[PDB]
């Protein structure tokens, strides 16, 4: 309990960099993935349309 919450608390406090940067890579990666899928589907749909 003591040492476990101390090591996990210190490691969790030192992980804020990977959490913020990884949350930014997941954020922009998911936004670019959804926007790229919808942009590709609408792109091919408009290309076949016209």
């Amino acid at each position: 309990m003591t040492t476990e919450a101390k090591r996990a608390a210190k490691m969790e406090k030192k992980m804020k960099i990977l959490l913020g940067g990884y949350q930014s890579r997941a954020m922009g990666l998911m936004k670019q993935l959804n926007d790229l899928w919808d942009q590709i589907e609408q792109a091919h749909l408009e290309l076949r349309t016209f």
């Binding site: 890579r25 997941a26 990666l29 998911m30 993935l33 959804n34 790229l36 899928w37 590709i40």
Partner: peptide, 9 residues
């Protein structure tokens, strides 16, 4: 498929 599945969140 330029999109590809989402990263393993």
């Amino acid at each position: 498929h330029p999109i590809r599945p989402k990263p393993p969140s």
